[PDB]
Amino acid sequence: EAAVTQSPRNKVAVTGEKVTLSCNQTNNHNNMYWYRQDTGHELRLIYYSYGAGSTEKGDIPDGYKASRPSQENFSLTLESATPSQTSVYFCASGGGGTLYFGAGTRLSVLS
Amino acid sequence: SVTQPDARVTVSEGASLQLRCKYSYSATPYLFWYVQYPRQGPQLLLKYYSGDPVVQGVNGFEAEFSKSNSSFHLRKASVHRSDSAVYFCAVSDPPPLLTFGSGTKVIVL
Amino acid sequence: QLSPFPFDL
Amino acid sequence: GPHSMRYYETATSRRGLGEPRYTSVGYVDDKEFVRFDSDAENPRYEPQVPWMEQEGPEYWERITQVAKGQEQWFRVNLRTLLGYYNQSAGGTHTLQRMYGCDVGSDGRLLRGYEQFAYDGCDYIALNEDLRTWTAADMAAQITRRKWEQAGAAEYYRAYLEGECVEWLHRYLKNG
Known part of the structure; x- marks a missing residue:
């Protein structure tokens, strides 16, 4: 979906840096998600949201914080960047059933 | 939990392609197939909720749901260079959450 | 088992 | 003869009284056998009749987890409906869902809900088909549209x- 846009597409962070990945969706969907894929393999859920004001931990929420200020904005925050977090982050929205993903955000953590 | 037994698959351009997918999930299965082209996000190919066990998707793709065999195998009758990519099988684990497979890399010659 | 999470209104 | 199961989830938001109250009750034939209340000290799905006590702890666990998710769904859609009908915010409203299934003497589906x-x-309601x-x-017309588009019918079916x-x-x- 061209409705899901992440920012930025490429980010390099220093160890300890507070990083915030941003997602925007004009699909008018209530559900939004943040996955990470780091081997071109399985994508794993970090955090999701049932709608504005909702913030639910995924399978690997450690080191991550999330925020759903509004309907179309869901941001993932790495409070203190650590190399274990270098990976490609994908955001998705969905109104039940099908999930629509953004282009992805490649984030690397230099020590 | 969904399982894609093959990590890599190679086919001759023009030939048929079949990517296997097995699912172990007690509840109502809501299965999907996503394709991921290099430097891009996963895109929906097709999905199956109920009714016709054989679902059609974009780009001449189709899959068949088999409660008995517990599979949701993908198929395309004639692949082209364009189809080289990573294919994901996924089941709505507890909806509205989605659980992805390890994926399968398809290489066409 | 219950009906799955519903779609958005 | 035919049998039936039916679940009723109801969310009620009240004038500046914080987040809405969520409750879910299930009926087999015409007897309540399970229930969940968000007003409870410990929100959890619990057995309302003894024969339901013969369900594992894993059962009550995910059932309860579904309920917590459902609580959020209502919390959100109550809001989207305020918009659809152009109403206030501090207002008091109710949104409920009812689903279920009747089966014939042969134990196979007779009607879905x-x-x-x-x-x-x-x-809005799923027809017998x-x-x-x-x-x-008209507000519901909006939902119908996207649900027809997203194939919601097949999802629930x-x-x-x-x-x-x-x-x-x-x-x-x-029992």
Whole structure:
């Protein structure tokens, strides 16, 4: 979906840096998600949201914080960047059933 | 939990392609197939909720749901260079959450 | 088992 | 003879009284056998009749987890409906869902259910065919549209046709 846009597409962070990945969706969907894929393999859920004001931990929420200020904005925050977090982050929205993903955000953590 | 037994698959351009997918999930299965082209996000190919066990998707793709065999195998009758990519099988684990497979890399010659 | 999470209104 | 199972989830938000109250009650034939209350000190799905106590702890766990998710769904859609009908914010409203399945003497599905009511009035309901929808007013017309587009009917049907019927049986043998 061209409705899901992440920012930025490429980010390099220093160890300890507070990083915030941003997602925007004009699909008018209530559900939004943040996955990470780091081997071109399985994508794993970090955090999701049932709608504005909702913030639910995924399978690997450690080191991550999330925020759903509004309907179309869901941001993932790495409070203190650590190399274990270098990976490609994908955001998705969905109104039940099908999930629509953004282009992805490649984030690397230099020590 | 969904399982894609093959990590890599190679086919001759023009030939048929079949990517296997097995699912172990007690509840109502809501299965999907996503394709991921290099430097891009996963895109929906097709999905199956109920009714016709054989679902059609974009780009001449189709899959068949088999409660008995517990599979949701993908198929395309004639692949082209364009189809080289990573294919994901996924089941709505507890909806509205989605659980992805390890994926399968398809290489066409 | 219950009906799955519903779609958005 | 035929049997039935039916679940009623209702969310009620009240004038500046914080987040809405969520409750879910299930009926087998015409007896309540399970229930969940968000007003409880410890929100959890619990057995309302003894024969339901013969379900594992894993059962009550995910059932409860579904309920917590459902609480959020209502919390959100109550809001989207305020918009649709152009109403206030501090206002007091109710949104409920009812789903279920009747089975024939042969234990196979007889009728599926999935429907919603806002503020006491009908909103949208899956027809008997489990393929089309009935939309009360114009606001509901909006939902119908996207649900027709997203294939919501097939989504719910999937459950109504198998998972439900299967469990209605689990329970019918249990007592």
